[PDB]
Structure 1
Amino acid sequence: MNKSRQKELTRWLKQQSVISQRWLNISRLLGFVSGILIIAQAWFMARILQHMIMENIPREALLLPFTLLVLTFVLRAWVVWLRERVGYHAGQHIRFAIRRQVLDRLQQAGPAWIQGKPAGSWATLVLEQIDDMHDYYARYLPQMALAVSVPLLIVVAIFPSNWAAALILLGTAPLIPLFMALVGMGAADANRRNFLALARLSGHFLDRLRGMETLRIFGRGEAEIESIRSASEDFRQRTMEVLRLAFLSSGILEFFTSLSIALVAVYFGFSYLGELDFGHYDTGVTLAAGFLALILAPEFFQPLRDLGTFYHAKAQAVGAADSLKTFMETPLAHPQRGEAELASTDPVTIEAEELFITSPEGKTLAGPLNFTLPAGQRAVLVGRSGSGKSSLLNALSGFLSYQGSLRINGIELRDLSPESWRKHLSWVGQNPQLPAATLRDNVLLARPDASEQELQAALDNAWVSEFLPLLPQGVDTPVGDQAARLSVGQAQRVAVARALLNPCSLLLLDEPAASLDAHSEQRVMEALNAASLRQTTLMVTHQLEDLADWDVIWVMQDGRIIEQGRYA
């Protein structure tokens, strides 16, 4: 597959691992400490058993090993409790840091880039694609560091007692990976033969479920169940051939964890009888040396078995890594933040001589254009669809980086502080969203601490109080796309309330009456025409019948204004 990418992708993950490297070492250290307690377990049980079975020592006499075996059990359950808490803490700080880096890179990239992709798939990247990176750091890595350490302790702990039992466990150490690779050349062939189909045929139920409206109009409602049954009766028998060979890769681990316990039982069992006199260091084979190997025989393969379960969490954290790595490798262009100030709250005199507007992706938006209007002047933009007139409104707000020269009251916009520049700005898009939880908290978005009397003045000015009785809870009605939604006629009349609540210097109306009902249109226009003459404004409305009082009119067709002048 993508061998060139996977090796590189599996390397980016380890660079993210350094955020919680302190706990990924404690979790690795506790893997060794939990390894020691397993041999400590297996020795006390073996020594206790040999004394009882062979020396017939009463249980009360050998109470010291009993109170030590219990202590290891408590001390071994403690590190197990402690490992999957340090493991979680190791995997949480990765998610917390990446989610902060993703949100940070998604906020200073501006709202110009967020429009490029639906907000549902942005929330799919911040919710699921970063939570999928948990079990790799929290469970898989603290386990892959247990599959290379713990099984080695057993071999190191039986080798002093019996080199024959040490080789039986170690004999399967190279044999297991070889056989998985020998069956992996057939499993990865069928998984490639069915790769086209299963990917094409797994999203079948969702597509039928997603297009039920189109599926019931034409009467195919009861004829697609015969196509969901037939696309799921094939999904089974096609993935039951990939599984049929993918479960041999685990059977050849259950084959060696059974051959290695049978051999340890048969070899040691025959060694006591005097058959196989080749394993011990010419000191006789004690019974306790057999139980130590027998108890540790399953513990050798326990780590290699559990790693098989968490191995799916490696591709899951890689399949969700190409979405996040390429997110933070985009060359997108920031708006070139700077520091400056505007002392006067009075209307600003914007101007330009040679200006270009470029997308974060790097594509240009508006060609060479230049315009000047002094303070108090109220311009208006008209043009064909796709001319780029909203870009100019979208770049006067600081959302789009410009490589030309735009000047705010004699001060370059490039070096102007965006955090303080926007305090002298008001913005009304054609399709405005309502991010606040409730309508009352939505009008008071510029100044939340506004007095209730000031709030009432804005509502009457914006003609939103007229339909207030229609909503159930009055002004505190929750607003959104799932609870008591406002019509576009009403939702536009509360965005107007936002802009006029806090006095500003430059007002950027972006087609306030584009998608708006006839009654609300005359209410908004009456409000926004009386609220545009007291400062510099920039309207980009497309209907142009009422432009008599708009002093200057700029028309642009292909990213450049062609002629500017009054309606007359």
Structure 2
Amino acid sequence: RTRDFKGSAIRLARRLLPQRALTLAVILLGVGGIAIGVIGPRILGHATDLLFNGVIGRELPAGLTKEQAVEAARARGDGTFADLLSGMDIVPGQGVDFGAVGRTLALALGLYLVAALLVWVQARLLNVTVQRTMVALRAEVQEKIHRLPLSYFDSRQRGEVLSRVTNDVDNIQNSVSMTISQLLTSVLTVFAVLVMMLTISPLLTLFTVVTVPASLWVTRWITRRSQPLFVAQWRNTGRLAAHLEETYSGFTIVKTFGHREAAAGKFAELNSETQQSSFGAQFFSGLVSPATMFIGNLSYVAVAVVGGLQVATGQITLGSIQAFIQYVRQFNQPLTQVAGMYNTLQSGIASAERVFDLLDTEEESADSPRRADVRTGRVEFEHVSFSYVPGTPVIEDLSLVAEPGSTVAIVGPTGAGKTTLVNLLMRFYDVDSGRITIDGVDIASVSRESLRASIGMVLQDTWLFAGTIYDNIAYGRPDADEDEVIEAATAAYVDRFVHTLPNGYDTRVDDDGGAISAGEKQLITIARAVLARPKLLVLDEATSSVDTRTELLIAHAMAELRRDRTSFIIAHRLSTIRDADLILVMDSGRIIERGTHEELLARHGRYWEMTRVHLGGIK
């Protein structure tokens, strides 16, 4: 909950440090374009006062001077009028003198024209310094993603790391483009519009200064009174999506078991109560202005009335009151959007330390450059003792060895330590006091790129990025022509179902008709691995959904026929692992027994009783 505000704000501002010149060129250019839009009303008021001084002075007797005219006005009973005439500069018998008005308006138009070419450039530069410092952030995030260890990724909840690089940099965009454009000038249009408001009449400027507390108090009371409702509608639109998701995902089981009426009634009785709960949250949040504008006119009426009473008394000039009215209107605006200025900056800085916490974490092991080559394959383990958190040992001592060109296999119950053994083989996690020598040379000091690009691995869960099926299959080798892509994908038996699709090889498997099942989605990954032509192939529960015969054909065409390469085949179906070159039975690490199928079955170990659960049907 934004546990640091000063430091986070300074770090976010320091993110803007490289554009120091183009940020000074924004601050100084917005100061000069906001100190020119305030002096302009003074010039306009001087023009309208030059008008008034002649208009109410040309009917006075000519020859009569200012002081004697005021004395005559006071002698004839008009005291307020005499004070009025004494309150400005007039000369009886002279007209409007349009030359002065023209010369004043020619300056007013000049510095008003300057004030619109001096704000356009400021906005252009500001957008340049926003969209050039945010490329840096969105690229640093990407460079950090490909450097963090997997342990960072699996230890978070479902979308916590996703809604930290996508929806958590847009808020930085908003709260860095609104505090340099909409907030920086909203403070100058309170400081300068008040330093010029002061020089006109100090009495009048305190009739609006006492509406800054009166407006902040009401805009804060409304905000802290609209709490129970703005969190009772987020809580309700969450219960809405917690029902829509479960009635859309299990839609085949809502249609069947025909409770469509029940699912519609449940949605109806909690949509009519999110409507009525968002109604208040919007009414109270939209009445924030129709109330800070009531005290933006309680001050305006007082200013107008006192200004009239003061011009009529001769203490101030009409051309000054004209400018003071515009100053009141300008000073009144820097408040109608202060709630939307603070709840956007606070939100955009609370969701701005998540990015820096992500960027402040530890990188990977800083790989040593060796570019290890696999000649035959001697993946031999030596006393690997991996653990996730110190205190819970998952993989105890094991020293599995393989053959340059055999297919050593792994079986075991659920949670026995197979997928995280593959993870150890791929250096996703760090080994603990155990050597992992592949082909003699240890991979503990080996560049991760050269290792992982030479293994070749497929998993139980499939990944298909937004693209065509051809693109996903060719992702294993991007420089492969369709002649090599289709030839290496037919060996994984992808054609047999992709030709059945509406547009085979171009199905665009991110938004489909749902015509791809789990096994067909796994054959795509198998083909993608085939494209890379791996030398140390590892199928980690790859064929858990695809037919047990297609698995046999694939593992005999590209796993057993491949005499040159070796492979791990981790699977639960013993029918695909029998007669497959040194099966290993695991039970939470602690390899129970190993060897080929005959020696393993002729000893009545855990393998035999496990086959009795998988063939004898006893459990």
Identify the TM-score tier after normalising by the shorter chain. 0.7 to 0.9
Matched, 1:455 2:485: yes
Residue 526 of structure 1 deviates from its aligned partner by: 2.8
Residue 477 of structure 1 deviates from its aligned partner by: 4.3
SS at match of 1:537: strand
**CA displacement, residues 390-413 of structure 1 (integer Å, 9 cap, x when unaligned):** 111122122223233323333332
Residue type at the aligned position of 1:311 = Y
**CA displacement, residues 525-548 of structure 1 (integer Å, 9 cap, x when unaligned):** 332433554212112112223545
In 2, Cα distance between equivalents of 1:395 and 1:222: 49
| Residues 30, 119 of structure 2: 8 Å contact kept | no
Residue 551 of structure 1 deviates from its aligned partner by: 2.9
For residues 202-217 of structure 1, the aligned pairs below 5 Å read: 202-212=237-247, 213=251, 217=259
| Residues 335, 402 of structure 1: 8 Å contact kept | no
Residue 234 of structure 1 deviates from its aligned partner by: 4.5
- Residue 540 of structure 2, aligned match among 510, 518, 523: 510
For residues 500-539 of structure 1, the aligned pairs below 5 Å read: 500-518=530-548, 520-539=550-569
Which residue pairs with 2:336 in the alignment? 305
In 2, Cα distance between equivalents of 1:348 and 1:130: 45
SS at match of 1:402: coil
Residue type at the aligned position of 1:304 = L
Residue 39 of structure 1 deviates from its aligned partner by: 1.8
Which residue pairs with 2:30 in the alignment? 31
Structure 1, gaps ≥5 residues long: 278-284
Residue 317 of structure 1 deviates from its aligned partner by: 1.4
Higher CA-based Rg: 2
Which residue pairs with 2:416 in the alignment? 387
SS at match of 1:470: coil
Which residue pairs with 2:293 in the alignment? 254
Matched, 1:18 2:14: yes
Query: When the two structures are superposed, what TM-score results if normalisation uses the length of structure 1?
Result: 0.83
| Residues 411, 585 of structure 2: 8 Å contact kept | yes
- Residue 107 of structure 2, aligned match among 53, 57, 68: 68
In 2, Cα distance between equivalents of 1:363 and 1:324: 32
In 2, Cα distance between equivalents of 1:165 and 1:222: 62
Residue 17 of structure 1 deviates from its aligned partner by: 2.9
**CA displacement, residues 486-510 of structure 1 (integer Å, 9 cap, x when unaligned):** 3333333333333233433311111
Matched, 1:543 2:573: yes
Matched, 1:337 2:367: yes
The alignment of Structure 1 onto Structure 2 pairs a total of residues equal to: 547
Matched, 1:433 2:463: yes
In 2, Cα distance between equivalents of 1:460 and 1:225: 47
Structure 2, gaps ≥5 residues long: 55-94, 600-619
Which residue pairs with 1:44 in the alignment? 43
| Residues 50, 288 of structure 1: 8 Å contact kept | yes
- Which shifted more, 133-142 or 362-371? 362-371
**CA displacement, residues 170-193 of structure 1 (integer Å, 9 cap, x when unaligned):** x42xx62376348746863x4565
Q: Indicate the structure with greater strand content.
A: 1
CA gap 1:370/1:195 in 2 versus in 1, 3 angstroms: farther
In 2, Cα distance between equivalents of 1:403 and 1:50: 88
| Residues 380, 550 of structure 1: 8 Å contact kept | yes
Residue 115 of structure 1 deviates from its aligned partner by: 5.3
In 1, Cα distance between equivalents of 2:226 and 2:292: 21
* Aligned-CA RMSD value: 3.6
CA gap 1:384/1:116 in 2 versus in 1, 3 angstroms: same
Give identity over the alignment, percent.
22
Which residue pairs with 2:213 in the alignment? 177
CA gap 1:163/1:305 in 2 versus in 1, 3 angstroms: same
Which residue pairs with 2:379 in the alignment? 350
Residue 386 of structure 1 deviates from its aligned partner by: 0.8
Residue 154 of structure 1 deviates from its aligned partner by: 2.4
Residue 38 of structure 1 deviates from its aligned partner by: 1.7
In 2, Cα distance between equivalents of 1:458 and 1:46: 83
Which residue pairs with 1:220 in the alignment? 262
**CA displacement, residues 283-336 of structure 1 (integer Å, 9 cap, x when unaligned):** xx33333223222121123223333333331243145346545544666x7355
| Residues 215, 292 of structure 2: 8 Å contact kept | no
Residue type at the aligned position of 2:273 = A
In 1, Cα distance between equivalents of 2:105 and 2:393: 79
Which residue pairs with 2:454 in the alignment? 424
Which residue pairs with 1:281 in the alignment? none
Residue 454 of structure 1 deviates from its aligned partner by: 3.3
SS at match of 2:380: strand
Matched, 1:264 2:303: yes
| Residues 31, 150 of structure 1: 8 Å contact kept | no
| Residues 230, 278 of structure 2: 8 Å contact kept | no
CA gap 1:183/1:57 in 2 versus in 1, 3 angstroms: closer
CA gap 1:206/1:184 in 2 versus in 1, 3 angstroms: same
In 2, Cα distance between equivalents of 1:312 and 1:452: 54
